[PDB]
């Protein structure tokens, strides 16, 4: 199997620089797209920066634009994130993910979902709406609703992630309604206008987690995550 190993995380002063790293093993990183998503302590997911597969086109998030840089190193089978002029809000665990080539899908929409995440690395410095929380009992049925706008969800492929406290996020649904190998079919995704929906029939005790949705936003030119839903199963 494949994995991303991250290192570089450290306690630093404000204004300091710091270089994070996301190394690939089991596969060759140069032939693949990737992203950097961070998660402040007690916050939700937030896109930061990314790399296009066949070229080397970077895109950055408005917050960290001009401070952060993202190069690759085909020789060390990895990709670095150069963070400069750090600020206290940058405080968070930074994840890195590969976006595989989507067999389905189409021109300009071939790298939509993040299917292999890293384990994360802490950097300490001295939008789409979902409900805050839903609840149910085992055997029942929840529906997590993700609503946005034309710019993003109406036009673009949407994807859902799952996340137990402390662990890295996991890909549940991509391209609106598909699911990767080894995901129970009791997970179902759909879309209707400018809002998508995650569906869990036959709820179980392990399903208890945080659920995010995500989609590219054409007008902002960023990748967007939802605020997140805390699913609670009555246990």
Ligand X SMILES: O=C(O)c1ccc(-c2c3cc(F)c(=O)cc-3oc3cc(O)c(F)cc23)c(C(=O)O)c1
When asked if residue 156 is in the footprint of ligand X (CB under 6 A), the reply is: yes
Kindly tell me which residue out of 29, 95, 111, 174 binds ligand X, with binding defined by CB under 6 A: 111
Within 18-47, which residues bind ligand X (CB under 6 A)? 33, 35, 47
When asked if residue 216 is in the footprint of ligand X (CB under 6 A), the reply is: yes
When asked if residue 226 is in the footprint of ligand X (CB under 6 A), the reply is: no
Within 158-197, which residues bind ligand X (CB under 6 A)? none
3-state secondary structure the chain: CCEEEEECCCEECCCCCEEEEEEEECCCHHHCEEEEEEECCCCCCEEEEEECCCCCCEEECHHHCCCEEEEEECCCCEEEEEECCCCHHHCEEEEEEEECCCCCCECCECCCCCCEEECCEEEEECCEECCCEEEECCCCEEEEEEECCHHHHHCCCCEEEEECCCCCCEEEEECCCECCCCCCCCEEEEECCCEEEEEEECCCCCCCCEEEEEEEECCCCEEEEECCEEEEECC
List beta partners, residue 19.
82
Which of 157, 225 has the CB closer to ligand X? 157
When asked if residue 94 is in the footprint of ligand X (CB under 6 A), the reply is: no
Q: How far is the CB of 232 from ligand X (least distance, A)?
A: 30
Kindly tell me which residue out of 19, 52, 91, 187 binds ligand X, with binding defined by CB under 6 A: 52
When asked if residue 112 is in the footprint of ligand X (CB under 6 A), the reply is: yes
* Region from 49-57, 127-135, 138-146, 195-203 binding ligand X, contact rule CB under 6 A: 49-57
Q: How far is the CB of 9 from ligand X (least distance, A)?
A: 20
Please report the sign of the dihedral spanned by the C-alpha atoms of residue 97, residue 100, residue 104, residue 107: positive
When asked if residue 100 is in the footprint of ligand X (CB under 6 A), the reply is: no
Which of 72, 230 has the CB closer to ligand X? 72
Q: How far is the CB of 115 from ligand X (least distance, A)?
A: 12
Q: How far is the CB of 13 from ligand X (least distance, A)?
A: 28
Place of tokens 């996340």: 163
Q: How far is the CB of 33 from ligand X (least distance, A)?
A: 5
Which parts of this chain interact with ligand X (CB under 6 A)? 33, 35, 47, 50, 52, 57, 59, 108-109, 111-112, 156-157, 216, 223
């Amino acid at each position: 199997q494949v994995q991303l190993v991250e290192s570089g995380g450290n306690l630093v002063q404000p204004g300091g620089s710091l270089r994070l790293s996301c190394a690939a093993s089991g596969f060759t990183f140069g032939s693949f797209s990737m992203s950097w998503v961070r998660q402040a302590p007690g916050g939700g997911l937030e896109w930061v920066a990314g790399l296009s597969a066949r070229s080397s086109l970077t895109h950055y998030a408005d917050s960290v634009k001009g401070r952060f840089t993202i190069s690759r190193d085909n020789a060390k089978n990895s990709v670095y994130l150069q963070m400069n002029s750090l600020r206290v809000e940058d405080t968070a665990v930074y994840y890195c993910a590969r976006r595989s080539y989507d067999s389905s899908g189409y021109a300009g929409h071939f790298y939509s979902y993040m299917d292999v995440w890293g384990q994360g690395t802490l950097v300490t410095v001295s939008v789409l709406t979902q409900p805050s929380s839903v609840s149910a009992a085992p055997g029942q049925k929840v529906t997590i609703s993700c609503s946005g706008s034309t710019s993003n969800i109406g036009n673009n492929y949407v994807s859902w992630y799952q996340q137990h406290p402390g662990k890295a996020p996991k890909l549940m649904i991509y391209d609106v309604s598909k699911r990767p190998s080894g995901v129970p079919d009791r997970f179902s995704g759909s879309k209707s206008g400018n809002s998508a929906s995650l569906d869990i029939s036959g709820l179980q005790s392990e399903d208890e987690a945080d659920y995010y949705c995500a989609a590219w936003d054409d007008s902002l030119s960023e990748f967007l995550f939802g605020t997140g839903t805390k699913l609670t199963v009555l246990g």
